[PDB]
Design a protein around this ligand. Structure first.
Ligand SMILES: [Zn+2]
Length: 312
């Protein structure tokens, strides 16, 4: 009975020493097993695997609690879906475009590089160590893990088309937004004044208009009385906000926003590209950069810098 010593893990931090029988496959001893993203379930150990670290599924109490602590998901197929995505994203290219980590086009991933590009420009911290650690590696240029996690957390697979806003919604559920607050003043002609306070993801996102200012000037609201009142922004406490709408012609001017996403083509199969604002306007389209004086185009999401906003 020849054996070699390896480590199993669900989080790449807690390592569990194992003696593996070289007579049997990894799958017979650990269940489904992965090495650096590749499925090694069907193969028997090699000599050179001595001391390597293998991902396995959470199959006992210790692994399940380490997996929850690391991923904060309570979906049991998560790690397998993560690994299956990572088998692809590890073969993607993450070039520096405009000082940011982008993604070379592959597997219909253009919506994902827009997500990735936007997140590097926001001041955001993630509640799940898996996301926080991969986020750090992504901004340094090794974003394969971060992309695969974004897919797994969004219940999307490699090669599916996607929506930036829907993707950001899932990610920000694992962001630390407990201090994020949005105060909306609502008053009907009939029932008087009321203060709605949004927190968390709903404090930083809005669907319906691309303009942060249109939230200050007023949005129409249903009321339990029966009439239509008006609410608007009296207080915002967050490091950013994200304004979204169906694709509409929008002017983007330097100094007035943080970054944005353009969407061209059909709803069934379109093309996202990232617009950011530095010394001039940048368009980041996968690995391709274009600088521009002005911009007017089909925009679906605009991000704005924020800190503390009050009308007291
Ligand atoms: Zn009313």
């Amino acid at each position: 009975v020849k054996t070699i010593k390896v480590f199993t893990t669900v989080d790449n931090t807690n390592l569990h020493t194992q003696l593996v029988d070289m007579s049997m496959t990894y799958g017979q001893q650990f269940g489904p097993t992965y090495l650096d993203g590749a499925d090694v379930t069907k193969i028997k150990p090699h000599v050179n695997h001595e001391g390597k670290t293998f991902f396995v599924l959470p199959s006992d109490d210790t692994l399940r609690s380490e997996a929850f602590e690391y991923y904060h998901t309570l979906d049991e197929s998560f790690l397998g879906r993560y690994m299956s995505a990572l088998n692809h994203t590890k073969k993607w290219k993450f070039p520096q475009v405009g000082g940011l980590t982008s993604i070379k086009w592959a597997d219909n991933n253009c919506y994902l590089s827009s997500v990735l590009l936007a997140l590097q420009q926001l001041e955001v911290k993630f509640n799940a160590p898996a996301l926080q650690e991969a986020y750090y590696r992504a901004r340094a240029g090794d974003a394969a893990n971060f992309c695969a996690l974004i897919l797994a957390y969004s219940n999307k697979t490699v090669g599916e088309l996607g929506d930036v806003r829907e993707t950001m919604t899932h990610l920000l559920q694992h962001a630390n937004l407990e201090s994020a607050k949005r105060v909306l003043n609502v008053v009907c002609k009939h029932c008087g004044q009321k203060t709605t306070t949004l927190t968390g993801v709903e404090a930083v996102m809005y669907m319906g208009t691309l303009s942060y200012d249109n939230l200050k000037t007023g949005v129409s609201i249903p009321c339990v009385c029966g009439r239509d009142a008006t609410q608007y922004l009296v207080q915002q406490e967050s490091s950013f906000v994200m304004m979204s709408a169906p694709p509409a012609e929008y002017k983007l001017q330097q100094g007035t926003f943080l970054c944005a996403n353009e969407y061209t083509g059909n709803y069934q199969c379109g093309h996202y590209t990232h617009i950011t604002a530095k010394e001039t306007l940048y368009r980041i389209d996968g690995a391709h950069l274009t600088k521009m004086s002005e911009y007017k185009g089909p925009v679906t999401d605009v991000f704005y810098k924020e800190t503390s906003y009050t009308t007291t």
